[PDB]
């Protein structure tokens, strides 16, 4: 009924202070992707709106850059960035697909 699947760039461990690329990809469906969100359980980081492009949430402006593609680049990692990240695809007519990335910002 809902055939598509999400690949991700995989679960991440990274040193404090670097920048890193998170990305998902929807495959094996032809639904139109109307909106992609990046979230953190309680927090919205960015919206790529179908025909309008990317908006970064004002509470993440200088921490997150849009791209590449439908992905994000987190900019100067802090231990607080550790957590689960979600790419959420709003599609017609399949619906909502979600993929999950866990990020662990270490202090080696």
């Amino acid at each position: 009924m809902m055939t598509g699947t999400i690949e991700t760039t995989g679960n991440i461990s990274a040193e404090k202070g670097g920048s890193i690329i998170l990305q998902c990809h929807l495959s094996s469906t032809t639904a139109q992707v109307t909106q992609v969100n990046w979230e953190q359980q309680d927090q919205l980081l960015a919206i790529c709106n179908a025909d309008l492009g990317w908006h970064i949430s004002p509470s993440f402006k200088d921490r997150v850059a849009p791209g590449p593609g439908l992905g994000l680049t987190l900019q100067s990692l802090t231990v607080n960035d550790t957590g689960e990240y979600f790419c959420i695809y709003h599609t017609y007519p399949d619906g909502t697909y979600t993929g999950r990335i866990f990020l662990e910002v270490l202090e080696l």
Partner: antibody
Amino acid sequence: EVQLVESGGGLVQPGGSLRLSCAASGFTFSDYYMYWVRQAPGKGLEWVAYITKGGGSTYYPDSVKGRFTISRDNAKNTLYLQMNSLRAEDTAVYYCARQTNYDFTMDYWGQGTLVTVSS
Amino acid sequence: EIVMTQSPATLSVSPGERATLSCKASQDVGTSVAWYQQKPGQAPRLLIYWASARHTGIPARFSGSGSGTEFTLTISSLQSEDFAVYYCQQYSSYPLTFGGGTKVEIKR
């Protein structure tokens, strides 16, 4: 149909405290980020507070930080604004507003409560 | 804080004509600008988001444009009901800031 009904405004004295409420109906309140916005008599619009879906993060401008506290009860579908140390320049119609789920701005507003601070 | 300047604060336009409201930004706000219409005794309603996108239920004679620091709202085929104060707002960064407002008086 989406509705934001506000209550709790009134007259309260300098230094006093008041709690405004905003009852949401017609959408999944727990899905939505919320704000409060105020407007002094004959003046423009002033952002006042912001709360996340859950309640774990809040933001305020300096003008009000420390004295106002935004909170929410997703069980009751109700948003609250807790006001302390009310000064004169806090007289205003206070609006609640839900954030667009397609962008980061203010989709729909309540009718507002008047809050008069005076001796 | 990013200061949103709406000038003129007042415009007098004849019915059927085209009003052009201006909104400048003290710094680049990208396209994270919205436009609200506030009629007397009424809550603001959202007209434009994302600098140029029209909220649903909003007549097509309302149109927004601009990026960076200079933004514009245009009310075509102006009519009596359009009498209101119009505010621009930036949501690029905190604290969120509204413009001063431009009252559109209909010059009958």
